[PDB]
Amino acid sequence: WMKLGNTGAMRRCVKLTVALETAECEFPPHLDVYIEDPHLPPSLGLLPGARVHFSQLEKRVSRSHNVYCCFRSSTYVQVLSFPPETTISIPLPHIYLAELLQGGQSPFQATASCHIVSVFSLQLFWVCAYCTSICRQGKCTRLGSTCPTQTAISQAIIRLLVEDGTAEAVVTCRNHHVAAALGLCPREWASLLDFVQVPGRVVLQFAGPGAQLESSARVDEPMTMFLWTLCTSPSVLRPIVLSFELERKPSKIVPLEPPRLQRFQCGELPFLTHVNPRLRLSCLSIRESEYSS
């Protein structure tokens, strides 16, 4: 704070996420609004669910090409309605993944009745609660360097292929969701995490559907054996109902490039084809459906 302006300790900055209202799109794009410190505390009535007219906002873009808006000396705010007394149980829409390959006018968030094809990679960690670096069995490497005390927290990242009969997409699934992505009972997932705390880190990286483990990991450890066998078994590769975000914020600003060439090899015939870049989806929840196998 106060890197150039002298207003040090002028209360903490505040960040609003808002759903735009317009008739120009069937789906309202979400947006971030930053209230930098000289305006604090904010106006009354800026609460979840409150419909608000924001006027004279400064539009701004990051170096990473993310659009976000910020208050200025002319920014003026006007609440139009109060929060509702009861939260609306809005279910997300259900669409086939082919709908997202159409580009614009496709929803930001959705559910899909897809089927897990294979698992690309899988990482488990235990990191220190006060500082984001690995902490095997609670042995913090940052101890004393800002880190006041040693205690550890688990973290997990997994990457999946999902396909629903119309299109195939790469799902990046993180933390508590993976326990459902693999389908373990909370007890068994807890036990697995508790064991892997001994080495503190487990990394796997697969050569593809049904293929062998890649040299980033080794056949020696029985841990890796158990995990690899599971991640290629019909116990994971199963039907689901996914709910996801399109990995890129809903906007027209995205860069673009032509469809790439890929050289398939099917039936001993070389196929050379133009092909789209794969969808990338961020998981929101995994659930079994109809207990299908």
Residues of this chain, 19-78, that bind other proteins according to CB under 8 A: 34, 36, 60, 62-64, 66, 68, 70
CB of 163 to other proteins, least distance (A): 6
CA angle (152, 122, 112) in 5-degree steps: 115
Selection from 74, 78, 31 nearest residue 51 by Cα:
78
Selection from 112, 103, 110 nearest residue 25 by Cα:
103
Positions in 104-123 near other proteins (CB under 8 A): 115, 120
Number of neighbouring beta carbons within 10 Å of residue 33: 20
Show the tokens assigned to 192: 């697995």
Selection from 60, 34, 28 nearest residue 46 by Cα:
34
Q: Which of 91, 103, 144, 267 binds other proteins (CB under 8 A)?
A: 267
Which entry of Zn ion, other proteins, none binds 252, CB below 5 to 8 A by partner kind? Answer: none
Positions in 214-233 near other proteins (CB under 8 A): 215-216, 222-223, 225-226, 229-230, 233
Show the tokens assigned to 40: 């604090």
Q: Which of 170, 180, 241, 246 binds other proteins (CB under 8 A)?
A: 170
209 binds other proteins (CB under 8 A): yes
Positions in 100-139 near Zn ion (CB under 5 A): 128, 130-131
CA distance 173 to 283: 5
Instruction: From 10-18, 44-52, 79-87, 104-112, give the range in contact with other proteins by CB under 8 A.
Output: 10-18
133 binds other proteins (CB under 8 A): yes
Cβ proximity to other proteins, 88 vs 266, nearer residue: 266
CB of 191 to Zn ion, least distance (A): 25
CA distance 283 to 170: 10
Q: Which of 16, 28, 96, 245 binds other proteins (CB under 8 A)?
A: 96
Which entry of other proteins, Zn ion, none binds 165, CB below 5 to 8 A by partner kind? Answer: other proteins
* Owner of token pair 């009861």: 86
Q: Which of 95, 147, 170, 180 binds Zn ion (CB under 5 A)?
A: 147
CA distance 281 to 37: 35
CA distance 166 to 161: 13
CA distance 15 to 2: 17
CB of 129 to other proteins, least distance (A): 10
